[PDB]
Amino acid sequence: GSLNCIVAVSQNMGIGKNGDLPWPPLRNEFRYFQRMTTTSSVEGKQNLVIMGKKTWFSIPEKNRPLKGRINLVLSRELKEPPQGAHFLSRSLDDALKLTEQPELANKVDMVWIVGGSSVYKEAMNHPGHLKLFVTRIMQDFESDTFFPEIDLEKYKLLPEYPGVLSDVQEEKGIKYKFEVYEKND
Numbered sequence: 001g002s003l004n005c006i007v008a009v010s011q012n013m014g015i016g017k018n019g020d021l022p023w024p025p026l027r028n029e030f031r032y033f034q035r036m037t038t039t040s041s042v043e044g045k046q047n048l049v050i051m052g053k054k055t056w057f058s059i060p061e062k063n064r065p066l067k068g069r070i071n072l073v074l075s076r077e078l079k080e081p082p083q084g085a086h087f088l089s090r091s092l093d094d095a096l097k098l099t100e101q102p103e104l105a106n107k108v109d110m111v112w113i114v115g116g117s118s119v120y121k122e123a124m125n126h127p128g129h130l131k132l133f134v135t136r137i138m139q140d141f142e143s144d145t146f147f148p149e150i151d152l153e154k155y156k157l158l159p160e161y162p163g164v165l166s167d168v169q170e171e172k173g174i175k176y177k178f179e180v181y182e183k184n185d
């Protein structure tokens with residue numbers, strides 16, 4: 001099928017700091033992430049969330065696995081899914097493979113990439129339809145991990161998107177904007 005990426009990025013393209021988010025917790029932005037990644041109208045099926053190993057451990061243990069979603073972790077030097085994770089794959093291809101194998105066949109509604117820099121960079125270059133759900137955190141934040149540039153040659157910003165607020169949001173005195181990008185490539 002198609003892939004969704006979801007990310008929140010500072011104005012300096014930061015996504016991470018010290019294995020956590022660069023900004024303080026934004027409850028309603030987290031609830032947006034939860035709603036977008038969890039929402040599945042197909043009764044009997046759940047969404048697949050795919051993430052790198054560091055992203056997995058950046059989720060507080062009490063929120064692992066991400067409830068109402070199939071949690072799959074990518075790791076090349078791990079051979080059991082980390083404690084609480086539903087699946088492990090050695091590559092994005094292997095994770096997508098898994099979708100049409102007995103483990104996940106007719107179990108998976110949508111696929112959400114939530115995983116770190118390398119997972120996004122690869123997902124973003126994957127053939128077929130891609131949507132990037134990008135929360136623009138409209139402050140600079142000190143960050144050690146960054147979201148790759150969005151290639152405008154293939155990706156276009158959609159002006160609005162059904163189910164996504166169009167106006168700038170503000171929580172805990174931090175403004176942000178929900179964006180959705182799309183390629184057909």
Ligand SMILES: NC(=O)c1ccc[n+]([C@@H]2O[C@H](COP(=O)([O-])OP(=O)(O)OC[C@H]3O[C@@H](n4cnc5c(N)ncnc54)[C@H](OP(=O)(O)O)[C@@H]3O)[C@@H](O)[C@H]2O)c1
Binds near residue numbers: 055115122
């Ligand atoms: N929206 C956001 O703001 C957002 C989203 C995600 C993460 N973050 C933040 O970013 C940081 C974590 O992201 P990160 O980029 O540092 O790490 P990450 O991509 O979650 O994890 C890196 C590790 O995951 C595994 N991995 C990554 N790509 C893989 C692939 N294609 N195949 C197999 N395994 C793969 C590797 O593990 P092995 O070494 O075991 O092979 C790699 O060392 C944290 O600070 C987190 O809070 C923020």
Ligand SMILES: Nc1nc(=O)c2nc(CNc3ccc(C(=O)N[C@@H](CCC(=O)O)C(=O)O)cc3)cnc2[nH]1
Binds near residue numbers: 115
């Ligand atoms: N838009 C967006 N915002 C983010 O903060 C985000 N974070 C990651 C990676 N980090 C995290 C960290 C924590 C949780 C988390 O705790 N999620 C819970 C929230 C539950 C609650 O608020 O009580 C969840 O159920 O989804 C998810 C991803 C990936 N994509 C993102 N995308």
